[PDB]
Design a protein around this ligand. Structure first.
Ligand code: UTP
Ligand code: MN
Ligand code: MN
Length: 566
């Protein structure tokens, strides 16, 4: 079975597309080499299709079935709720793509009669029609990155596939509770999205330490969605089916599984049939959960086949990292060879062969890695970092062009503890906000795939709640880590780290002599920039009325929104 079949019609864009970074009178303050930044467009959709299109051979053995059951027994433990039309409407983001039936996200969240009437029929249809493939739209995703060291090396557009708005709301009523609860229940501490960065770190380390002689690695499959089979999707459904569900929920899931999740026809923006999918759809509510479960299921089985000792995994979508007891170098190399031979068999071959690692700071996953620093008292603190090239490039692009979702904000949140996050991002953006007094204007950013509405003035609280205070006092980052950041600044033409020490004192000052919420931002966010450092006390309101539901589950491509946590 082929992951895709193409009729020749083009993946077309729904609007015009900006691909280059125009000469900015403020972004150059950030990055000077504009020709290094680029956003993906329809033009490269075909290169993507070729990467994404191939036959799938899958062989399932005893360990796989053994693991399936263990997972199912756990899922058996869950009672999932049917979400009401209203609840699901609220979960829809304000700029979620509009329906082909004459209403948009706004209409849906406002509970328009037209919108709710269509949703109801889409739901009724889920109960009356058990087999007709549901229409999906295929588009090229616009994403900004830095040119490849191979000079002019570019990533082709990634393809996004999703059903009409109406179906999406139905998916929510039918599966939102499930997709928010089953992953943990089934994978325990192995489910990654349940952890804030601070927790993901605690869990990696306490695990690494828990080993007499630790050996670890990260695994990532070559274009995972395409590797997901119809079989894999039905197994996924067998897992969902073990929950106690309402009758209509149970049929909605069952119908959604055959009509949408296993495959369906592909339609472009001009309304033409581009082909057919027989693999995971990037834009359905189940794709995060589905991928984690499938990833976890295959990997657990692979461990037992490769006979790895005391394996402990952490899974996020298709992002896998396993920490086991080293059984000797030579030994370890053969185990990963086997592990991979098994993953490949289960229909999930690697992008790059996994390398056994013996230094936790050396294992990278989710595009991130753990690093060490020291706090106020110099007590070796641990945190999560990542190469800053893509983040800095995106910050650049978001500066020259108001985009709907502001990744820089998100990166500050998740990476607040980091060197680059504090010294460049925090500095750059707080002066831009200062200038236009956009401190109060809330922005949309996403975490683990769900879009969140956030007020910059609340970063101290948020940062404090998530990383602790050490996030405001880390000071002796690793050589390795500092070298990476500097090397990257050179690559992008971003002014060296010390140039930023300067900029911050200013911004901060212009933030202390501002009072209120703005002022606090000034005291806590740039304490690394002032000569005369003060002693930061736990923020009152922060570790208080600060909302949650933030690190419960992944919703990438799931059309999820929350306007909580100020
Ligand atoms: O919302 C989405 C979209 C995509 N995917 C799928 O999960 C994988 C996570 O993508 P990766 O970071 O693994 O990149 P890759 O090397 O596997 O594939 P290239 O993207 O760089 O082409 C993607 O490659 C995609 O196929 C999801 O799981 N969820
Ligand atoms: Mn992948
Ligand atoms: Mn990945």
């Amino acid at each position: 079975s082929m992951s895709y079949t193409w009729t020749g019609a083009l993946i077309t864009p729904c609007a015009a597309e900006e691909s280059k970074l125009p000469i900015n009178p403020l972004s150059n303050s950030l990055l000077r080499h504009h020709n290094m930044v680029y956003a993906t467009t329809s033009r490269s959709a075909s290169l993507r299709q070729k990467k994404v299109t191939f036959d799938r051979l899958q062989v399932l053995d005893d360990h796989y079935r053994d693991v399936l059951k263990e997972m199912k027994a756990k899922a058996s433990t869950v009672k999932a709720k049917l979400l009401s039309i209203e609840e699901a409407c609220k979960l829809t983001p304000p700029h979620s793509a509009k329906s082909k039936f004459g209403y948009g996200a706004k209409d849906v969240r406002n509970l328009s009669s037209r919108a709710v009437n269509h949703i109801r029929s889409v739901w009724e249809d889920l109960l009356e029609d058990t087999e007709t493939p549901i229409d999906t739209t295929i588009m090229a995703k616009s994403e900004v990155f830095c040119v490849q060291p191979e000079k002019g090396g570019r990533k082709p557009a990634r393809l996004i596939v999703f059903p009409d708005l109406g179906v999406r709301v139905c998916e929510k009523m039918a599966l939102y509770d499930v997709v928010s609860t089953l992953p943990q229940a089934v994978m325990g501490s192995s489910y990654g999205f349940q952890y804030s960065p601070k927790q993901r770190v605690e869990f990696l380390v306490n695990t690494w330490k828990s080993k007499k002689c630790p050996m670890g690695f990260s695994y990532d499959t070559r274009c995972f969605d395409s590797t997901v089979t119809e079989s894999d999707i039905r197994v996924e459904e067998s897992i969902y089916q073990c929950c106690d569900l309402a009758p209509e929920a149970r049929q909605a899931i069952r119908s959604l599984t055959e009509r949408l999740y296993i495959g369906g026809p592909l339609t472009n923006s001009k309304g033409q049939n581009c082909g057919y999918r027989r693999c995971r759809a990037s834009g359905v509510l189940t794709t995060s959960c589905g991928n984690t479960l499938t990833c976890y299921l295959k990997a657990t089985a692979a461990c037992r086949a490769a006979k790895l000792q005391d394996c402990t995994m952490l899974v996020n979508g298709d992002d896998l990292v396993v920490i086991c007891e080293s059984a000797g170098t030579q030994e370890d190399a053969a185990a990963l060879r086997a592990f991979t031979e098994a993953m490949t068999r289960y229909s999930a071959p690697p992008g790059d062969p996994p390398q056994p690692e013996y230094d936790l700071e050396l294992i990278t996953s989710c595009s991130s890695n753990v690093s060490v620093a020291h706090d106020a008292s110099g007590k070796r603190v641990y945190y999560l970092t990542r190469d800053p090239t893509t983040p800095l490039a995106r910050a650049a692009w978001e500066t020259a062009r108001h985009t709907p979702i502001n990744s820089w904000l998100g990166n500050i949140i998740m990476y607040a503890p980091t060197l680059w996050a504090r010294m460049i991002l925090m500095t750059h953006f707080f002066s831009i906000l200062l200038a236009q007094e956009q401190l109060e204007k809330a922005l949309d950013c996403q975490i683990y795939g769900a879009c969140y509405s956030i007020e910059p003035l609340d970063l101290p609280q948020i940062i404090e709640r998530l990383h602790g205070l050490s996030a405001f006092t880390l000071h002796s980052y690793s050589p390795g880590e500092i070298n990476r950041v500097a090397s990257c600044l050179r690559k992008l033409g971003v002014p060296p780290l010390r140039t930023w020490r300067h900029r911050a004192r200013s911004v901060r000052a212009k933030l202390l002599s501002q009072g209120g919420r703005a002022a606090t931002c000034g005291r806590y966010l740039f304490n690394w920039a002032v000569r005369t450092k003060l002693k930061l006390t736990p923020i009152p309101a922060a570790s208080q009325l600060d909302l949650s539901g933030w690190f419960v589950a992944g919703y990438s491509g799931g059309d999820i929104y929350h306007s909580l946590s100020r």
